Amino acid sequence: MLSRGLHEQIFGQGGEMPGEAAVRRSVEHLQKHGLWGQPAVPLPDVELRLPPLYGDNLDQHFRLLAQKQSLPYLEAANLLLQAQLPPKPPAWAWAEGWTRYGPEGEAVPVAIPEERALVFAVAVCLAEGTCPTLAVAISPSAWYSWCSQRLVEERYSWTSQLSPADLIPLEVQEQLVVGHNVSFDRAHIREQYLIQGSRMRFLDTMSMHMAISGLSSFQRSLWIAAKAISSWDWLDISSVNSLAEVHRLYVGGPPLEKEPRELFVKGTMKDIRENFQDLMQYCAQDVWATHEVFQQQLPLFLERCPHPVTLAGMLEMGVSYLPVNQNWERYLAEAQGTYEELQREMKKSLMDLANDACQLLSGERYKEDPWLWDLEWDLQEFKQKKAKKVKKEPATALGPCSEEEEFQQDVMARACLQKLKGTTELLPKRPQHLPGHPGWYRKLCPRLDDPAWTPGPSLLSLQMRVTPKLMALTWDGFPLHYSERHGWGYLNLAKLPTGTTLESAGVVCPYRAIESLYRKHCLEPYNDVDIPGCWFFKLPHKDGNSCNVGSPFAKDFLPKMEDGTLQAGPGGASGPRALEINKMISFWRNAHKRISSQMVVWLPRSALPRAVIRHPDYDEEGLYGAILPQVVTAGTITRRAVEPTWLTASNARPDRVGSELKAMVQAPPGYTLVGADVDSQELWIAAVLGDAHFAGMHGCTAFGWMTLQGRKSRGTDLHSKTATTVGISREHAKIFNYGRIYGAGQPFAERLLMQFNHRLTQQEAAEKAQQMYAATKGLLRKVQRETARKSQWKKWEVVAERAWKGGTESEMFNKLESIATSDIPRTPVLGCCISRALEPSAVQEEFMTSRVNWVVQSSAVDYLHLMLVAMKWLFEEFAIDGRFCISIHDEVRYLVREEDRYRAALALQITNLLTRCMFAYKLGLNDLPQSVAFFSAVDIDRCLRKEVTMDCKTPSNPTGMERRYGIPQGEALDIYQIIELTK
Amino acid sequence: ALLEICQRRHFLSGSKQQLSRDSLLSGCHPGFGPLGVELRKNLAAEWWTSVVVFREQVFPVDALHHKPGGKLRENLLHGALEHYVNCLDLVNKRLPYGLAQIGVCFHPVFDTKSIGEKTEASLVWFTPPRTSNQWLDFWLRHRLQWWRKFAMSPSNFSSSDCQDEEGRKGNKLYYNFPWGKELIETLWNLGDHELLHMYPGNVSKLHGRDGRKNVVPCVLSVNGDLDRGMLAYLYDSFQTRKKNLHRKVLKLHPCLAPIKVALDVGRGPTLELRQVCQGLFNELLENGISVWPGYLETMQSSLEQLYSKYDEMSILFTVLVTETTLENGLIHLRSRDTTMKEMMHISKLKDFLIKYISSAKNV
Amino acid sequence: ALLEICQRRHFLSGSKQQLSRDSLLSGCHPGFGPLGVELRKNLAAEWWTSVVVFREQVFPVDALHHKPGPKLRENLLHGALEHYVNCLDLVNKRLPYGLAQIGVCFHPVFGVKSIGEKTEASLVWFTPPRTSNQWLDFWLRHRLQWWRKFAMSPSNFSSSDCQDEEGRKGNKLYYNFPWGKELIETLWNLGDHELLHMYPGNVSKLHGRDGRKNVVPCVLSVNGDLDRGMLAYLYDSFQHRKVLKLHPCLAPIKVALDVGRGPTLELRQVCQGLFNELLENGISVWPGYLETMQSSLEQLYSKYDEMSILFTVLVTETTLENGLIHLRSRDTTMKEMMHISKLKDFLIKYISSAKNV
DNA sequence: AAGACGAGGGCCAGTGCCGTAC
DNA sequence: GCGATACGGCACTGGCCCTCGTCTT
Numbered sequence A: 001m002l003s004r005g006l007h008e009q010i011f012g013q014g015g016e017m018p019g020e021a022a023v024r025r026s027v028e029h030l031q032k033h034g035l036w037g038q039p040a041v042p043l044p045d046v047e048l049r050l051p052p053l054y055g056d057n058l059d060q061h062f063r064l065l066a067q068k069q070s071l072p073y074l075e076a077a078n079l080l081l082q083a084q085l086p087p088k089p090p091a092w093a094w095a096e097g098w099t100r101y102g103p104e105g106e107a108v109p110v111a112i113p114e115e116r117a118l119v120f121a122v123a124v125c126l127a128e129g130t131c132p133t134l135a136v137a138i139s140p141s142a143w144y145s146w147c148s149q150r151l152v153e154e155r156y157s158w159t160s161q162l163s164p165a166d167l168i169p170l171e172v173q174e175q176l177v178v179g180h181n182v183s184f185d186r187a188h189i190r191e192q193y194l195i196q197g198s199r200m201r202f203l204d205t206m207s208m209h210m211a212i213s214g215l216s217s218f219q220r221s222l223w224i225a226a227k228a229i230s231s232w233d234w235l236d237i238s239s240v241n242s243l244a245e246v247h248r249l250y251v252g253g254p255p256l257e258k259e260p261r262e263l264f265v266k267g268t269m270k271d272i273r274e275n276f277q278d279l280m281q282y283c284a285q286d287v288w289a290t291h292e293v294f295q296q297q298l299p300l301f302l303e304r305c306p307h308p309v310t311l312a313g314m315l316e317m318g319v320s321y322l323p324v325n326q327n328w329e330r331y332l333a334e335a336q337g338t339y340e341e342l343q344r345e346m347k348k349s350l351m352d353l354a355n356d357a358c359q360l361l362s363g364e365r366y367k368e369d370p371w372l373w374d375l376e377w378d379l380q381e382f383k384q385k386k387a388k389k390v391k392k393e394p395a396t397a398l399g400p401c402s403e404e405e406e407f408q409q410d411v412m413a414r415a416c417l418q419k420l421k422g423t424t425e426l427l428p429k430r431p432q433h434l435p436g437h438p439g440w441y442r443k444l445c446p447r448l449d450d451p452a453w454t455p456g457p458s459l460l461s462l463q464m465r466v467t468p469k470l471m472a473l474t475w476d477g478f479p480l481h482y483s484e485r486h487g488w489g490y491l492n493l494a495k496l497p498t499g500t501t502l503e504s505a506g507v508v509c510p511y512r513a514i515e516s517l518y519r520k521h522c523l524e525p526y527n528d529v530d531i532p533g534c535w536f537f538k539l540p541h542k543d544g545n546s547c548n549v550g551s552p553f554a555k556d557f558l559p560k561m562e563d564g565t566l567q568a569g570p571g572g573a574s575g576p577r578a579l580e581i582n583k584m585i586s587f588w589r590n591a592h593k594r595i596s597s598q599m600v601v602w603l604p605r606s607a608l609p610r611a612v613i614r615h616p617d618y619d620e621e622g623l624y625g626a627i628l629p630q631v632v633t634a635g636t637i638t639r640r641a642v643e644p645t646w647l648t649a650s651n652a653r654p655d656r657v658g659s660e661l662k663a664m665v666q667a668p669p670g671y672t673l674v675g676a677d678v679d680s681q682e683l684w685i686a687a688v689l690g691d692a693h694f695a696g697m698h699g700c701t702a703f704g705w706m707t708l709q710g711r712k713s714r715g716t717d718l719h720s721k722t723a724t725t726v727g728i729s730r731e732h733a734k735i736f737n738y739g740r741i742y743g744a745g746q747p748f749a750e751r752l753l754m755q756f757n758h759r760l761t762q763q764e765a766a767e768k769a770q771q772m773y774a775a776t777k778g779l780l781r782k783v784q785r786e787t788a789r790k791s792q793w794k795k796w797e798v799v800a801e802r803a804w805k806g807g808t809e810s811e812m813f814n815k816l817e818s819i820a821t822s823d824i825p826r827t828p829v830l831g832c833c834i835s836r837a838l839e840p841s842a843v844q845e846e847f848m849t850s851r852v853n854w855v856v857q858s859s860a861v862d863y864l865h866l867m868l869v870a871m872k873w874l875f876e877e878f879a880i881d882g883r884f885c886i887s888i889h890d891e892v893r894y895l896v897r898e899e900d901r902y903r904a905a906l907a908l909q910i911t912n913l914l915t916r917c918m919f920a921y922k923l924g925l926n927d928l929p930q931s932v933a934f935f936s937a938v939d940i941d942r943c944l945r946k947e948v949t950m951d952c953k954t955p956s957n958p959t960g961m962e963r964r965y966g967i968p969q970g971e972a973l974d975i976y977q978i979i980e981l982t983k
Numbered sequence B: 001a002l003l004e005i006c007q008r009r010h011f012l013s014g015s016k017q018q019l020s021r022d023s024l025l026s027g028c029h030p031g032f033g034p035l036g037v038e039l040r041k042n043l044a045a046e047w048w049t050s051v052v053v054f055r056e057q058v059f060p061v062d063a064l065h066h067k068p069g070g071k072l073r074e075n076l077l078h079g080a081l082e083h084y085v086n087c088l089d090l091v092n093k094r095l096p097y098g099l100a101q102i103g104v105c106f107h108p109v110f111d112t113k114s115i116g117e118k119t120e121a122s123l124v125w126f127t128p129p130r131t132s133n134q135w136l137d138f139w140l141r142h143r144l145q146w147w148r149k150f151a152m153s154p155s156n157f158s159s160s161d162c163q164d165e166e167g168r169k170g171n172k173l174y175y176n177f178p179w180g181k182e183l184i185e186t187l188w189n190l191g192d193h194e195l196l197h198m199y200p201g202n203v204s205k206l207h208g209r210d211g212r213k214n215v216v217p218c219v220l221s222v223n224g225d226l227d228r229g230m231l232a233y234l235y236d237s238f239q240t241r242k243k244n245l246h247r248k249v250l251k252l253h254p255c256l257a258p259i260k261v262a263l264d265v266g267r268g269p270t271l272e273l274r275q276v277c278q279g280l281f282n283e284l285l286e287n288g289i290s291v292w293p294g295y296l297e298t299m300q301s302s303l304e305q306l307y308s309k310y311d312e313m314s315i316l317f318t319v320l321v322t323e324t325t326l327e328n329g330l331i332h333l334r335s336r337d338t339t340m341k342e343m344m345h346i347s348k349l350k351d352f353l354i355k356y357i358s359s360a361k362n363v
Numbered sequence C: 001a002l003l004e005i006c007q008r009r010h011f012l013s014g015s016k017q018q019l020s021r022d023s024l025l026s027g028c029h030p031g032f033g034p035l036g037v038e039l040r041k042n043l044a045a046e047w048w049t050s051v052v053v054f055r056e057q058v059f060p061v062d063a064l065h066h067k068p069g070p071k072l073r074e075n076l077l078h079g080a081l082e083h084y085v086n087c088l089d090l091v092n093k094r095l096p097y098g099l100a101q102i103g104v105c106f107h108p109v110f111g112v113k114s115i116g117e118k119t120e121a122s123l124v125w126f127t128p129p130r131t132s133n134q135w136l137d138f139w140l141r142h143r144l145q146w147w148r149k150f151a152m153s154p155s156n157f158s159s160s161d162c163q164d165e166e167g168r169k170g171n172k173l174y175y176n177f178p179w180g181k182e183l184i185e186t187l188w189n190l191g192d193h194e195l196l197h198m199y200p201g202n203v204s205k206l207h208g209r210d211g212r213k214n215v216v217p218c219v220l221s222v223n224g225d226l227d228r229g230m231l232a233y234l235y236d237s238f239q240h241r242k243v244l245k246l247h248p249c250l251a252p253i254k255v256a257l258d259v260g261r262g263p264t265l266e267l268r269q270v271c272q273g274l275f276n277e278l279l280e281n282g283i284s285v286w287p288g289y290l291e292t293m294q295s296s297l298e299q300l301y302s303k304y305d306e307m308s309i310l311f312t313v314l315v316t317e318t319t320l321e322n323g324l325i326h327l328r329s330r331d332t333t334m335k336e337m338m339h340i341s342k343l344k345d346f347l348i349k350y351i352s353s354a355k356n357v
Numbered sequence D: 001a002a003g004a005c006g007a008g009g010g011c012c013a014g015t016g017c018c019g020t021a022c
Numbered sequence E: 001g002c003g004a005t006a007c008g009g010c011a012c013t014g015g016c017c018c019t020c021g022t023c024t025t
């Protein structure tokens, strides 16, 4: 009720828009495809009084919302644009706080630069960071320079107080702060860490550059290489995200000089004061260049991104807020402890193996070792120069008692010892590494004159290249090797020749111990090359490899390590345990710097909600604080968020060490976070782009009908329907599908599905070939399919027809290619044109995949922005405290309070409904299916995580530590209306 | 189960043949050799460092071996419990606070009528009821961490979570001997029962300031058998397939290793400026590093003999003084972990040893 | 008035009737306080250090407490005599050699009669009969000097000579209190009769090599008391002032640091820093910065002087600017000021400067 | 006695492979 | 014709350059 999926809506009375011919085509298509076995399972319709609409459509609704949200900031931006500039001061004031430079650059001591808008770039001495040290900010009126409290030499104690720069004005509109990577500067703002607030938003020239004239990483690689027929035309129309480069692009003036000494990151606080004036000058140059860049970008961005939803969305997407406490510090300590322990064990075992294998140097018995014969095995004993002389060999030159009368003979032997000691020093010069030990052992040791010297062979690894060959047995064979690739593995007769000969002089090789090792292995070039395992003699060549890259070292083959082949020796379960240890510390190894240095400001009891103090939590002399994620508003592509730490934050896995990082963001007492993850966005996006193209309805496609048919709760989604084939649930099937939409390469899908399902390649190939039915078919000498009914002809001039390309049957890649063909905007809907570097006008373009992905992911990001502005609209309109946003692409979580959580979740549901209805309206019809209108899962709890139930590794007991639980949602939240008076 | 000969030959234990696993696990052994009591000495010292010194609120306690009112003490927990009030006074009633003591305890054993003694290191941790379990898990992880280091294969040391007959939580620590796991340390949470029974009159002298309020202390307790632990490290030090070549050597941690370095005389014979060995000797012992003297000898044999002799004594390094070193000043050095000849300078050798041990204490 | 400042400063255990000198000299206790325990540990450490420098080689051992045949030990001789034949292998029968050990021996103290404990340090030196007396005199001098080094007065320690039909020559080290000179250490020259009683026969194992000569060794019995020695140095350190000037290398707690400025977290941070730094180099530091009130300075100094603390450190608010810290000596009571960075080196150099004989 | 070629080690950026998220 | 957008890590390496050594004038 009706039309195979719709709800009670007041978003337009008319309407059909029947398209009887089109729906006959669609029905016939879906019959021959064929799907005509409807389950007839109507989802429970919801009857609630919707929030007031402003008319006429929801388009003007979101437009007026986005405009009324971004109007003051646009005004401030315009104030920055028409700003007439007063020149830089002749000298910078060496005074704490802000210094205003107005007429002739006079120094006027100010606490807070009262301005509507300003550019900003903070400085911070990395030597003892991360506390601000300098800052410069220009305004449409005059100049400003802020100096930190680091003007007096003291023995400071840094617990990250409210020492960051003060920028906001007190009440008892309003603000806009622009800057290159403005999030970093925002992180150094005093009033941004407060639980409440804030009016001040931020605009990023880097993100804006990315929106206007951005380029992919693959482009960045060959862009900087400038130092594929028409692939170099966009080279001068775009640039990298660097400030100097983006200024050279948008301003095109003289090249701005950068600090040659890198004093802020390389030097101490001492050499900063010595060059204070110069550093201040450089900072001023930075804020000036950024000012210019902004001035030239704002109208360009306004042109390229005309819809205000993108603007306001980018405004709210830049003020993220992560509340934390002492549990953060405890987390750091415990995680680093566990990491150091596991690393200690691993390095202990490996250095043990490296110690007990060092003994077979005497005498020349290392050649017999089938693993250790490539390396050095050097024996050095240098050196000395003659000074003593002459002409005599220096190489050869039971009594019971109780005497003590020689009391001071000990000081005689002591004096002789010292006098002997002091004479040898001028014989050697510089202390070299231990020459007695072999070279492989020398390299595997820390230098003697190193401040971080540890005894024995350190620097063992995991993932080094010496140590795995040092101990491991090799796939039903004996030797591992490396050259262009390590020991081959994972990611009509064929024959090859053999050859053995002797010349010299080259390292001896042994091929018997290998065969004997194989004998011992089976005691329990050809043949045995395809499925079994063996090693030849010399060559070296492929002779039976599947992967085209190699893998040093086998670090994710636990199922191939815990099934016999392959194993290690000596010995036992040491191998799989070592792999386990590696897998445990894999995350924290490549992240610990980003989380340990992840700064955080603590707000004292003087500046926190007293209503939270009233709440029965303090907690026991506990410290409350927060950290702003420091997120670049728009990083390619499409204008997605970019953040070094939190966007690549691992999930709740009981295997990884720091896997609790996601769930360490704990809400303050009285507060709780409510969020949701769109399920699913890009899939339904491609679906809609298909059905809306084919006809009017949403279920008029072979692919688009299955997307809006499944429910995750006690049911089966499309991903889940592909995962139960079988099939692997569920993220893997997601990768397979989303990989299929953007290029289901036969060998890619092959080794992928084969990697995930773990079976034999033939049956797998059958599965792929069956699943390859979706992209089929497609289009002098050519592919045997054209617009003509048959390809065969004689002297038939048809160069005018070879201009159409389109797949057939199930999928709708034709529409994505249709958006990928237009030489102009290519923006659906909304609605923002990207990259002067990918716009096919004056581009070859050969960047197709990136642009299909651009289209769908753009729909995803505009979905994100729509969600942001929608959530913001009914959060200020109604009494829902806590408007702070924390978004991760698909997912988005707000920091609400315990008494306004269900209404906030209701706001999330309304938001999702309105956004889906927007995507439906931009293509028609305004009508939308049932199992896609509302969210299925709304997370509501203290710390943010994935599933409502959460286990972890390091703390071992989650609720053991001061925690709570989560709640699935749901249908029970659809009883609390947006009005304050509920329950 | 054949390293015992290495323990007899090189006295880390008694030369008596009757040293069964039962006689070693009961404490009815005739005693330990000098190298053994030295190993246990460094082990107990390493305990005292990583339990008492670095952690504040922990003070040494001296419990007697008997009672004023014949059988001796079974555990040195109660003797430390008797010292609760004064130690409360020296901490200004600031709990959590602990009392630590390493003393030999006497256990009655019916051999299937005798009594066996064994050195035990005990810490009694007086902690508020609000945070009892937290401190229990704390000490669990930390003790287990302390025992899982110094080991060549830390996998052998395990922990077992167990409850009492009434319901009191507790944790045991095991070491995987070649014949199975064996108890080496125990951690229990005593719900202020014994303290209540010891002071029935005025319980006001038991109240400890938890912070904003004075509460009755819950008595955490950790007791570690250092004899079974010394034997555990003894077994762990010794080596196991397709190595193709084997040498008898036990790999003890450089921190707890009985004899650190071994000084000898090479080439040999050389008279009579050999008094420099005495210099290096006193210089070495002055820095607190163990040095074995290879002066008066009957061998006069293959170097492999005394090299293996030192490897059986877990000696870290073998410093060799020869007449060429008497000329220039560069003595020989053979490491234990990696049997390899290496040249070095004298004071450089001293500082190398000090830095070696000190850094071995670290990561 | 010394026994009372050992009760309030936790050198001895809490007692009200068994606090007398007679009950202290007796093994009966009221055990020991943390300060006394650390003092005994440092004393025993210096004891083991003053015999490890002794050439050629003396092996440490441990003896059982109860009876092997079913009782508690009185002396620390038998257990050392049981490990003689074994250590013979380790000395390779080459020369005279000794066995040192520190243990808690017992003795009956006299209603009913009880049992007292004492921690004694013994050294059993096996030496040829012809060179036993000379070595006994050697150990006499070395032990006397050992007591003399940490002594505030060498005249307080004395050495007496004696002899009998069972022991041909012996020496006993006394200590003047001066409420009465008391036994502190015994140095006897027992024959092989003690050893020939537990190994007959066939006594062919007992005789060690002595310059191509086989000879059953005479047994030197060193037996010192570390408890009586502890009390000795306690009475040796007692000097309106009431300050115990124990030896720097002997003092249990050698430094203590508090705060002066009103209770601030930063002060505790700095103090924890100095705490860790000083403990990193093996320097016992008393934490009085906890604190909680920091009432007075004079009574605090009195407390730290009754605990024999070498130096007291004060971390004011100026330290959070210039790094300067308020040092205060004990032997001179000079209120000094020095940078916090140069404190470790100063204390270490000061302790190392007390290393002389 | 001064000058020039040669060998060893630190600092640098570049590259290959692995690791996480959506 | 095709995984896509990021984000970092460590292991390895060829190259610039200072330092010490050593042969040469």
Ligand SMILES: Nc1ccn([C@H]2CC[C@@H](COP(=O)(O)OP(=O)(O)OP(=O)(O)O)O2)c(=O)n1
Pocket: A677, A678, A679, A680, A681, A682, A683, A734, A735, A738, A860, A889, A890, D022, E004
């Ligand atoms: N390997 C991936 C993972 C994700 N995405 C894109 C596609 C969708 C978008 C959001 O990611 P997910 O939420 O993980 O996909 P989903 O289908 O929405 O999953 P769910 O139904 O659980 O929300 O990111 C992608 O392109 N490639």
Ligand SMILES: [Mg+2]
Pocket: A677, A678, A679, A680, A681, A890, A891
């Ligand atoms: Mg999703």
Ligand SMILES: [Mg+2]
Pocket: A677, A889, A890, A891, D022
């Ligand atoms: Mg997602």
